[PDB]
Design an enzyme around this catalytic site. Structure first.
Site, PDB file in Angstrom:
ATOM      1  N   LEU A  19       0.543  -1.134   0.005  1.00  0.00           N
ATOM      2  CA  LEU A  19      -0.287  -0.018   0.024  1.00  0.00           C
ATOM      3  C   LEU A  19       0.959   1.358   0.015  1.00  0.00           C
ATOM      4  CD1 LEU A  19      -2.623  -1.130   2.668  1.00  0.00           C
ATOM      5  CD2 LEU A  19      -2.744  -1.342   0.402  1.00  0.00           C
ATOM      6  N   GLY A  20       1.908   1.022   0.212  1.00  0.00           N
ATOM      7  CA  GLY A  20       2.858   1.858   0.432  1.00  0.00           C
ATOM      8  C   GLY A  20       2.783   3.759   1.318  1.00  0.00           C
ATOM      9  N   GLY A  22       8.793   1.642   8.026  1.00  0.00           N
ATOM     10  CA  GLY A  22       8.933   0.538   6.857  1.00  0.00           C
ATOM     11  C   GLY A  22       7.619   0.288   5.577  1.00  0.00           C
ATOM     12  N   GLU A  23       7.150  -0.293   5.531  1.00  0.00           N
ATOM     13  CA  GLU A  23       6.074  -0.527   4.760  1.00  0.00           C
ATOM     14  C   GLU A  23       4.261  -1.174   5.109  1.00  0.00           C
ATOM     15  OE1 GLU A  23       8.299  -3.506   1.929  1.00  0.00           O
ATOM     16  OE2 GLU A  23      10.043  -2.812   3.257  1.00  0.00           O
ATOM     17  N   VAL A  24       3.355  -0.488   4.382  1.00  0.00           N
ATOM     18  CA  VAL A  24       2.578  -1.082   4.819  1.00  0.00           C
ATOM     19  C   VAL A  24       2.148  -2.610   3.655  1.00  0.00           C
ATOM     20  CG1 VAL A  24      -0.195  -0.733   5.494  1.00  0.00           C
ATOM     21  CG2 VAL A  24       2.130   0.739   5.414  1.00  0.00           C
ATOM     22  N   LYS A  39       1.883  -3.506   8.747  1.00  0.00           N
ATOM     23  CA  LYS A  39       3.189  -2.463   8.697  1.00  0.00           C
ATOM     24  C   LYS A  39       4.145  -3.809   9.380  1.00  0.00           C
ATOM     25  CE  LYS A  39       1.975   1.189  11.453  1.00  0.00           C
ATOM     26  NZ  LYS A  39       2.408   1.279  12.535  1.00  0.00           N
ATOM     27  N   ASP A 130      -1.706  12.782  18.347  1.00  0.00           N
ATOM     28  CA  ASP A 130      -1.541  13.074  16.827  1.00  0.00           C
ATOM     29  C   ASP A 130      -2.821  13.340  15.839  1.00  0.00           C
ATOM     30  OD1 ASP A 130       0.791  14.421  14.935  1.00  0.00           O
ATOM     31  OD2 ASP A 130       0.981  12.453  14.306  1.00  0.00           O
TER      32      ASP A 130
END
Lengths: 287, 287
Positions: A19-20, A22-24, A39, A130
């Site tokens: 999905l972009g 690190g990476e998803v 994730k 957040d």
């Protein structure tokens, strides 16, 4: 139990799509058939996942519809995988970067759903810390979920320390150490952040986004700093302008709580439901 | 006062001599023949040097032998150069990594000189914020200079924000922004840091150096945290042990001030002078 498992997450999940840090990945549970989000974050030799146990437990013990669900974590071959609820449309930031600004109704619904989440967290003496469009997730049903900040924040800090962008704590006095954990956060800071988020959803960026961060820090800590406002007055109802006015109260002693804000005209109005977002998702897909 | 950031090639004024390890250069004033250090940092298109004016002014207005002198700054071809007093032996960290631990006398002299610097700063309502071996600089005359933390801190934070290791402040409430600027520093935090530094000079690492930073943050903020001690008891005088005991006082309300510390037996003893360090510099070069 934070349930950080020492096994290959691929034992339980089939990776499907990137999905972009690190990476998803979008992934599917091998037994239930459930979609999940995975994730992944690379670990270095000096990394220790056990230091993340506190933030992980904070997320795990959340039991509310509007908080992204946590399914577990996996440590395998120096990768940490965090398994969470799958939200197929991504964050609101992901969405508005293609659809453009949200309607007043859509924003109102989003705010109500965020406030329900916030009221829950604050009732558990937790703080989101957040709130922003990138942290509000939307599923294909048009439901809204707050993403976790705590885990990502700790990973971020570790990276910054590794690269010496921020200091390490070994020489720090305990007062300083405490602040470096506590931060400026109190529960009512989430309310201000939601207020800024509403503007962001309305205008595609928070106030002062084109201004240098250190400059904005200097500006916003002045006495007499003017709380931001919606730029186009005629575009928005008196109620929306009022919501912005009250959430963006400078004095945290006078800034309304989440439950108080759930009473506000803007988010208590009848008609607010997920179909408003289903509309947004159709616009996303078909324009 | 003016921060004197010049829009000029610093080589209009200085000949570069050698790289010391952005980049740090030994350099010589073309006019006076004075040696200087030029610290170079790459600027991104995103960058605004004018946001550094506050920290630059804080350094510029220092007028004390034990604070590194500031001569000016240059912005040229997307490089920022900061020109400061030249300290030919580098930092104490640079030095002890070759020589091994310092003698109690050498440490006692360094502490006294740091304390004179801190007393000055504190009298000017400034806080150093990063006392450690790497920020204590030594010249060829064996004199002791505190290096600047503030400018580097801001550059580091900007890099961290850029890579999203830390967040931007656009969504932050004013309370949160205020803490992010104040950071929990108070003048007495420099005293604690000096205590840690004395241990570092004696043992070649601060306490808990082999422990993960986040874990040390958690440990050091408990109410019953035991302040660090010198590892080897017989090696050090009662006076040194006591110096450590009192500088590493947990409550800032009871921690001794810089000038109170200057009365301590360890640093008030006769015989402390730069010759002690001239010995260390001979050891660095020859033994």
């Amino acid at each position: 139990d934070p349930d950080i498992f020492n096994r290959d997450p691929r034992d339980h999940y089939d990776l499907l799509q990137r999905l972009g840090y690190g990476e998803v990945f979008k992934a599917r549970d091998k037994v239930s058939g459930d979609l999940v989000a995975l994730k992944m974050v690379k670990m270095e030799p000096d990394d220790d996942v056990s230091t993340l146990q506190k933030e992980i437990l904070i997320l795990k013990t959340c039991r509310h519809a509007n908080i992204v669900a946590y399914h577990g974590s996996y440590l395998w071959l120096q990768k940490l995988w965090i398994c969470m609820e799958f939200c197929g449309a991504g964050s609101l930031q992901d969405i508005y970067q293609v659809t453009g600004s949200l309607s007043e109704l859509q924003i109102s619904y989003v705010c109500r759903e965020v406030l329900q989440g916030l009221a829950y967290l604050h009732s558990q003496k937790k703080i989101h810390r957040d709130i922003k469009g990138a942290n509000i997730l939307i599923n294909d049903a048009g439901e809204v979920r707050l993403a976790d900040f705590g885990i990502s924040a700790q990973i971020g800090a570790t990276l910054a320390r590794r690269l010496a962008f921020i200091g390490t704590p070994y020489w720090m006095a305990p007062e300083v150490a405490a602040v470096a954990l506590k931060g400026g956060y109190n529960e009512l800071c989430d309310i201000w952040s939601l207020g800024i988020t509403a503007i962001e959803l309305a205008e595609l960026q928070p106030p002062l986004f084109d201004v240098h961060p250190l400059r904005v820090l200097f500006l916003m800590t002045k006495s007499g700093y003017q709380p931001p406002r919606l730029k186009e007055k005629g575009k928005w109802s008196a109620a929306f302008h009022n919501f912005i006015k009250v959430t963006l109260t400078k004095s945290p002693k006078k800034r309304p709580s989440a439950t108080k804000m759930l009473s506000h005209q803007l988010v208590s109005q009848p008609g607010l439901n997920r179909g408003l977002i289903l509309d947004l998702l159709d616009k996303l897909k078909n324009n």
